[PDB]
Design a protein around this ligand. Sequence first.
Ligand SMILES: [Zn+2]
Lengths: 206, 46, 122, 180, 48, 37
Amino acid sequence: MLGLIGKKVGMTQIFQKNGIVVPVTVIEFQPNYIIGKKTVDRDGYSALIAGSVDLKSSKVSKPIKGQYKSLKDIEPKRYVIELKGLDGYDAGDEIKVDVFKSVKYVDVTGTTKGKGFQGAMKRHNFSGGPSSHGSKFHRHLGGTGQATTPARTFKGTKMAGRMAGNQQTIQNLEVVLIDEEKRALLVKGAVPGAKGSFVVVKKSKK
Amino acid sequence: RVGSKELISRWGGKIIMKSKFENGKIKHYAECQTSKNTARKPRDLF
Amino acid sequence: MIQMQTYLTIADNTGGKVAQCIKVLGGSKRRYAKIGDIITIVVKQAIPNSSVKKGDVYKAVIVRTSKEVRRKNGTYVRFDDNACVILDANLSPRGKRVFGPVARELRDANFMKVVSLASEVI
Amino acid sequence: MSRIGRLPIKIPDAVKVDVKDNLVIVEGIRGRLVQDIKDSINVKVENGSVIVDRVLNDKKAKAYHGLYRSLIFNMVKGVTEGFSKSLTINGIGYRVEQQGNSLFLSLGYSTQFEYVIPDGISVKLDGNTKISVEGIDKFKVGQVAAEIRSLKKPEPYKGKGIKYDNEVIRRKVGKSGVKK
Amino acid sequence: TPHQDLGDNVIIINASKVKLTGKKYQQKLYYRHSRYPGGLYSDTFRTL
Amino acid sequence: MKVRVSVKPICEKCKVIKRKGVLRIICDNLKHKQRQK
RNA sequence: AACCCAGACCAACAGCUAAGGUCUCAAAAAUGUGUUAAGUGGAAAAGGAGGUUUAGGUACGUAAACAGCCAGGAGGUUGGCUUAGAAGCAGCCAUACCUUUAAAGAGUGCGUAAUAGCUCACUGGUCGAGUACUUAAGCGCCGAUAAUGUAACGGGGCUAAAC
RNA sequence: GGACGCUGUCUCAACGUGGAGCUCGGUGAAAUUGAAGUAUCGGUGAAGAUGCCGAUUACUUGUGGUUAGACGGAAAGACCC
RNA sequence: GACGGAAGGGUUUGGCACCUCGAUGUCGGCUCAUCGCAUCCUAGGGCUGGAGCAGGUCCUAAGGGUAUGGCUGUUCGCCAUUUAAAGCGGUACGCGAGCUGGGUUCAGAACGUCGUGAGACAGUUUGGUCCCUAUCUGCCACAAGCGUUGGAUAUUUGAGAG
RNA sequence: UACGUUCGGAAAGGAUAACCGCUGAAAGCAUCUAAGUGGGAAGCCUUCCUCAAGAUGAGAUAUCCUUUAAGGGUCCUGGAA
Ligand SMILES: [Zn+2]
């Protein structure tokens, strides 16, 4: 599956030729290199290891350094991922942004924004109690279980706790524009993560 | 009326769609005469 | 964003002057109607001795809203009062003339005759 | 048991039969067919004829007796004369056509049905409303004719659909039969 | 001695060719529960 | 059709069979079809 | 706790037994003759019912029984009618109607306004001995169906490690 | 009871402010308390099981939340007799 | 499908008085659900005195969904607009150490009826405190220690689970 | 933050409920079944997304280090946390 490690620059909008506005998210692609390969007869499966923006030479541990010993003029890469079942490339290669030039839809994977310790009403769209008529119940859970049967709280009951921070992959984002000179992709819609967080863009499954 | 959209491919073909058969399994499936590309649902051909 | 209990100006010459929305059609929990939707109204005030009496229930189409709704080209049109037009059984305007402007989403919602009888389309 | 289980099997001259290790091969003018035979039943070829008997007398063996007799008989009649089952397409605007190893059916649906013909089986047309499936195996011939019929099962109000030729469709009435 | 571990170890080969009798091949069920409500999952002998 | 507990022939042309472990009645008069509950 | 076995003076790293079991978890079994294919065993009614083991009756037969197939399946006579039409088949009385009688009912069913028409009972050939309906006993099937999770052998599993 | 006007009462909630809550330093309780290396489900049972049988799940130990249970604590039930 | 017969379900009204009176807080409503299928709708069928359409009856199937207002404390019921459809039950007739006190079930007062009266009345109307900082188990989340058999740093196959 | 914007509820495959078969018995017929062989659904299992080797069954692997090295932690300046 064709994929790339990009950085979510932000959002903007563009004007189609006839006047229709399209709200887009912009992704900037630092150069991506193929660092190694995984093979079915040696690792158990076939995948390509892909890496991106470099690290500072004072903060590269020697295991990471030795990972790149045999590669020529490829500094250590901070973001490393795997592309399963891909061919057409080998160690030392380098993937342009134009691999999406023939693609209509993409999928983007990133780390969603963190919202801290969040309550039930925000986390699960719980309604609350009334704010008047004598109510002493505003944004609490309400009841949680049943009385004596089962005499416990079922596993998976939704309560308060941390919100957000998980990975998530959003599907079928239309591809609006590709700009090779500035290494940018413009997709239509929202992309998980805060500004400057790093996403992975894959060719759409459908 | 917003004029009845002519059921067209993205490759300029009509999507006539038909019914393959194979091994008890009856299949309705999409077809373009311009490009002969076979899929099932004309979603995939706009 | 017309919901239930909203007051509306009847913008045609049937006789009614104020209507109240009592249902938003087409949807189970549907809560808001926009320009070009059909609602069920009760008449709360009418011109005396007219063909429309106070307290009758009809279907009406929304022609002006006071909350702006996005269009494809990015433009938003926000009127200054909420107004509707009464319809007969065929989902066609019961009246013969329409007062004031209307919004052009009636064009897309296929109310061409309301659009024509309007004075200005914005 | 019953006489079909014990009735002897004649062998046509052009047809050869052979039994070995729970298997039977029947090679004829038009093809070759194979069969499994269970342990409790014994199949013998003698004097240009086939006989079947049972080592045991459990009811499974009782049924097997007739089952394998009949199968081997249909296995021999096929390699000599082949099996053929026919069909009729009746109804306004219903058509059938052939291209290579597939059939195209126009049966009122908004799509024209293509139909791959499985191997080992031939299809014969008579105009555009009569079909006849021919082949070496009765089982396969019946299967194909059945699946084609299932493509558009008949109906009783007007006889429309794809019917077996030998079948008789019970018929009902609609509007005018209820006339008072 | 049931107190302690004094027996030998066992390697089973050809574990995929064990034969069953009756209709067990179609009817024996292996159940499991995820501990979440309603999360009871069955699995017949074939599929397992 | 007549998923009953007592399945009996209705006309002399109805016939009794047993399929996969249920008792059934089959007839030309499709109105007579039956299976035990 | 109430059922079954069995009345504890104390100690023992002794033996024989009761109830209850002898595949294992978990101390204890094997051989012989039958049944069971439903995991019945390991819940339950009336009833339905070519399940099968065994035993016993009534129909029926090597002089051609059942089933299938090849023919006949008639006429007097719309049987008398009721009714508007009943021809075998809205319905009523009976078929104490004989006849050429292969064998053919005052017609078995379907469908016809009423008929027509298509079929059955019956009988002849082909093939070749059990068939066709009941009764008694042992295991079975559906019936059989509630809510935190397989949950009506303790479980694993067992076609005997069931009876 | 109805009408007018007015509104976050409601569809529908979000944001902000102030005192607590959160961490650290000092000072420092209460009711309760047979103990505890206290899991769940299906059953049984003084007839609603943390302690029994079968089975399943579970590395050890905290903190911030929420009360489903421990027929919670408080009041020798006020009702009935 | 008349007149009858044989069973299940344990939800309605009851029987019984077995657990509980050094306290098992009783009816609705709000918030939050979960489970059964005897299935309201969507799905797959059989047959119709099923022409089509629209149905009726029956089988399989619980994955998802199954409305907002006027009246009543109301469950229920009725009524007005809807929707493909506005299901039936269990879970202390789900859920007050979560909320609400309208009603029920205190002491006020008045009315109707009965009693000589004091008073009584699942007759009526009005007013009339809802306590508790969570020890354990359970659940929603984040860490500490430790193991994974040389010790660490990264990329991941996947049981299993949502 | 939604009162906003964008996207998602598929398609396909395997085994199947009810139902319908094909070839054929026991029972010369017939029969979906008894030997086989099939179609068949918002249902089941894969497939989509998230978590996941404390899965003690503790996986696979690329590189570094070889008596305290590799590497990690504390401290401090801070965040998209
Ligand atoms: Zn019949």
